[PDB]
RNA sequence: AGGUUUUACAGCGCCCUCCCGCCCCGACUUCGCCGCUUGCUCUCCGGGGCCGCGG
RNA sequence: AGCAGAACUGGUGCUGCGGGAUGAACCGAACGCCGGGUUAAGGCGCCCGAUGCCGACGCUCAUCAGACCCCAUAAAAGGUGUUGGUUGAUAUAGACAGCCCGAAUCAACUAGCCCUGAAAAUGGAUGGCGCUGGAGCGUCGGGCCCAUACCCGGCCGUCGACGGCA
RNA sequence: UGAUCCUUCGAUGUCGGCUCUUCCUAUCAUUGUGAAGCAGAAUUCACCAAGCGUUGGAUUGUUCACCCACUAACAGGGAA
RNA sequence: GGGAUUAUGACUGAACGCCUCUAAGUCAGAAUCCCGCCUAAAAGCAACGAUAAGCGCCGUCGGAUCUCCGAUAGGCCCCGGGUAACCGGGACCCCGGCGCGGAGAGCCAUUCGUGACAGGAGCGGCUAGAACGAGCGCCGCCCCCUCUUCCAGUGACGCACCGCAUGUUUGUGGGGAACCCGGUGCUUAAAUGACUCGUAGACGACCUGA
């Protein structure tokens, strides 16, 4: 069955200016500028409204799989707006039983060195992505905050650290060491 | 049955051969959809032979003529009760279509059953065809066309006439 | 993005088929692929023409769905679709293409001596403006 | 120039049987079966150049030779036409130029 | 086009491999000379991992006793398309070998053809023959990952070819802008010669 | 579900009718919505290919 | 068992031809030498004659896709891949999901295409290229392509005549 | 290992070993992983995977066996 | 030594208000795969040296003669590209065009010559071009006077070869050498046999030296 129409509106706040040239949405606000390119969905994105226009997407004659991308694209633009208005904060903590994990941040947050993981002499040097800044958070023992505008870059950088501190040839149910994501919050709470 | 082209509706009536024991036997009317009257007569002796005890040699066909549509210029919502024999067993099925004439609606049923259920022409048996109002339609594929002030564009017009100019300097546009 | 929709009353141009080149009015939409068009002022009886043969124009009329051609004819003349159509460019490209296809051999001769002289006048003015611009 | 362009595509064949008595042509601007009705009957020509000089009607003996023919009927739905020449065309002419004259005219 | 032209320079960007080669192989048999440029822009249907596996499975067909005689697995996109056309020709004969000589394939647009108009076969394009929701694989990326070593140099020379043609098109636009202005300044002197063009439907 | 509740600032059905109330178009090969055919269908009625051998 | 032995009929042996890439037997059709016309079975992206139709509708994405008599392999059992269908149960006396919100939701079963099940040795086989708005599967329309087959005519020969001539 | 007897009896040299090359994966080891009645060590089940390695000897004509040591492991086969 | 990735573990995120590595879109990833490194070098090729009255070019003008071999029968019409969009114009906007005439269904050429009377509009400089490079572009002097292109005229003549085919183009075509003809070029050219060498060999070949 081809549904004749399936739409979804995305209301934007007054502090951002969402623009688009075809399917290339560009969100600009107080913290930065984001720009995604949706030339793979084959949809239309109309920007309607008198003041601070809302974003309305459409999908004409779409099957069950093509209609699933309607809310996906709307959910990506909301993350673009949320990432510029408030920003993203993916803070993760260090878990260890005997050997404390020593983490030092270099290159102004764009690189993180992980040492003393399970007593290993190897030094793990994980490099963040463009726009993601890392820092050892205060007011806590060994938590590690990651900030940025793009959710797909802050969350991917938080995965590069967690995937780097993996235990090999051991029972992962016994050796729970590593750096795991604690919570996925925001920079400016609102 | 071959189901060639458009299946036309034939009103085939028949009766047993009159004898001295049963003079003027009962007449049986049938609603047959067949490409021509030669097949429509054979379809009559297929359902009547399995409903009543009467073959082609024991009875006769009294009338076999076309049944034209009373309103060929009005969109109608049809409902077809059928039963097709799959590879495993026989299944009853009720499908809704939408066409101007009942001759073309049943034709869509043979194209749909063959496309979705791989059912040939000899396995499908049409039982009831009824012009259903727009309130008793159960299928959402027809109920979406039951919206007044309907509006939808024609996105991504695929280029036909790909061989009138077979070679050209212009790439085809698909937005109109 | 889209500016031409398949709505009740949308005047559509038949691209190919039996009534090739004549306008119709979409009265009702049967399926995803078919429509119930009816051109009362053009010469096309009411029938089910597919969307493959239709080309949407920029003219909409005020008619309910599945209305008689008596009322379609009224809204066809109230919106003067035939007057708006004949004065459009897409209708004048068709008229100009029919003239060129019906040109005789004497016409192709008179049309050749014209563009051979008309282009020499324009190409001389183009070089005159080009030298002055340099 | 008073002749349209054609191409000797091959002989009237099946899949593994050739009939050299009938040749298939490829007209220049004819890509439909309904556009061959003009060329039916026009005289064809396979103009080639051999080594020795041959006589020429209406001129000095040049090095040019010709094989005459005519268009007989349509072939398929793609504007191909059949042609029967006086002598069967040599197989080396497959893909070369065939002249389609404008006579016998019917316009 | 469609005019029995002397040399048909078909562009390769956007076209499908077998769709374009099925038409090119038919034109070379009729005696025409086809020049397919930008063979690295041809794309094949199906996702990339399928079309790469179809070629990796082709690399294994070497002759066992002596691979020097086995199937020559060409890595250049022009030579990949050239072999696709060869499979659709009777290359074992003389008319099939002569038809391959009429076809010339290039990776990019060389100087002999960068100043020519490139044609487009609509019966072989990606937008016309493939649904927008289907996957496709570019022959340039497919060739680079199987042993093509000249993808960066072709992309560098193609960028210089585009920036050199963009400078001319800016001069072609400013020349056409003067041509349109020339007709407005001389319209009173060509009114007699433009009406016969209007009368016979040449000018709308 | 047009207009402000079923015709109203559009229309869509179904009945009794005023003689089928009354006229005009007849499957449109006769003005490209849909079938079957001569009750010997009519045409110095057009066009193309093929060959007229014998006596 | 491409095994052994029977029955009816056909074929083959003794038989070429068009189609099934290939072939003893399958499908069509049986044969003097030729011109024209038209078909059968089978076909019409290119090899390769013919859809270079603005063919109709729908199904289908496969990191071993699929591609049709004989025929050149695939099963049980599974899928919240997707599309139909059957039978029931909840829900503005406000369900389902979520930690109040306010419109549909849930379960069983069944059938299509696809997928898992699916491992063999020289490099390789829808016939090849390749094809994914298709060149795939199912149901159908128009047109077109050619056999030594059908039709008309020429020629040879054989056969027959209730045959023609002193 | 049979069953069959289509090819070969105006001949296709026939058991094993030696030698040498190549392929298959139904993976013994090594590389990357998933699972446990995975605490570690050891081991077991499974996945992508045949790139690479898979031994020296006593007895037997033997393929097949059995033992002695070595080893990351001493995996199973095809190519008349 | 790298590259795309398998198994696998994940990100964002719907379908299915939640959830979800997957549907669209992304990340890490290996004795495997491809390539580099390495070995060979094609009926594949480039740069460059020298080229023997004799041996080319010049002056594509050959002025004319002969022989061959293919085609062909106006065009070497150039943005990049998108497709749920695009193009053009003007100081992210605005205007205009959009079944696409700022149109490869078109456009640019082109419609028999020779002699008078009116309308209409071949060398010097600079710059740029190397993926398989030139009649390449732009200005300033000379050249005579343009059948310049179109519309109208008047009087002539260019066999009008008596109905008939291979006509017409790119053709001042591409290759071998031939013949009087007006100017140059530099002509201290190389390979090979034998001998020698032994960094090399069955014989050839190969490395050398005179
Ligand atoms: Mg362990
Ligand atoms: Mg049947
Ligand atoms: Mg057999
Ligand atoms: Mg038997
Ligand atoms: Mg036997
Ligand atoms: Mg017999
Ligand atoms: Mg077969
Ligand atoms: Mg015949
Ligand atoms: Mg075939
Ligand atoms: Mg299971
Ligand atoms: Mg579910
Ligand atoms: Mg419940
Ligand atoms: Mg399978
Ligand atoms: Mg006869
Ligand atoms: Mg035997
Ligand atoms: Mg395995
Ligand atoms: Mg198990
Ligand atoms: Mg890598
Ligand atoms: Mg994954
Ligand atoms: Mg990656
Ligand atoms: Mg362009
Ligand atoms: Mg606008
Ligand atoms: Mg004068
Ligand atoms: Mg030059
Ligand atoms: Mg002048």
Swiss-Prot record, chain B:
It holds the Pfam family Ribosomal_L18A. The keyword Cytoplasm applies. SUPFAM superfamilies: RplX-like. One of its GO terms (cellular component) is cytosolic large ribosomal subunit. One of its GO terms (biological process) is cytoplasmic translation. One of its GO terms (molecular function) is structural constituent of ribosome. InterPro entries: Ribosomal_eL20, Ribosomal_eL20_dom, Ribosomal_eL20_eukaryotes. The keyword Nucleotidyltransferase does not apply. It comes from the Eukaryota. Its main location: cytoplasm. Belongs to the eukaryotic ribosomal protein eL20 family. Component of the large ribosomal subunit. This is Large ribosomal subunit protein eL20. It comes from Danio rerio (Zebrafish). The lineage of its organism: Eukaryota, Metazoa, Chordata, Craniata, Vertebrata. The gene is rpl18a.
